[PDB]
């Protein structure tokens, strides 16, 4: 097979031994599925609690041959321009510490208990919101910390490549992009990147209530299948 395993509420020792230490991805069930965000966060709730706040928005075109420009707008404007009406471009309220900006929302989540297995402080855990329409796509990339990616709204297709396959992923030569792959995962140029086709991977569709553990430096690729809202915990 090649799917990420799903475990229900495993023990801290079981998670530590079989996944954190060796660096193996896993989906945790029955952990975040009773967080209040799982029943409260609708577009209506998000507009009520956050609608008038300014948020950074990444905007790019469906044509992949562009950069994402970074702008500012109110959550109300974001929802109106990029979620409800057919938009020319895709907009993504991505990698934002919304819960520091709006503590009222921090009541609706928690920090997974498994984070305490790390060697860092809880006051150093980065919490980011990923709120966007169907069709947002990350590059294939790796991050310098452990990650819990919690799906709240919608589904996301995720592809994972171990740091050991890095050679077949053709990272960019620039220093600023050495953590990012040059390959388009879902339509690769196998004439320019032939080693990509035989690089093994894990994949999953992450659904609401589920938590994907992305080991530090594990390459991950993310595409939103629906109107989606995710919360990531970056920790060490
Ligand atoms: C700011 O970055 C952008 C900008 C535009 C499009 C995609 C991305 C990155 N997309 C992710 C990266 N990393 C994670 C993770 O959990 O580490 C999650 C996502 C996710 O889109 O859900
Ligand atoms: Mn990432």
Numbering used by the authors: 181 to 416
Structure paper excerpt:
We have shown that JMJD5 can catalyze the diastereospecific C3 hydroxylation of specific Arg-residues in synthetic peptides based on the sequences of human regulator of chromosome condensation domain-containing protein 1 (RCCD1; i.e., R141), with which it is reported to interact in cells, and the 40S ribosomal protein S6 (RPS6; i.e., R137) in vitro.
Thus, the 5-aminoalkyl-substituted 2,4-PDCA derivatives inhibit JMJD5, in part, via competing with 2OG for binding. Crystallographic analysis of the JMJD5:20i complex (see below) suggested that sterically more bulky substituents may be tolerated at the position ortho to the methylene linker.
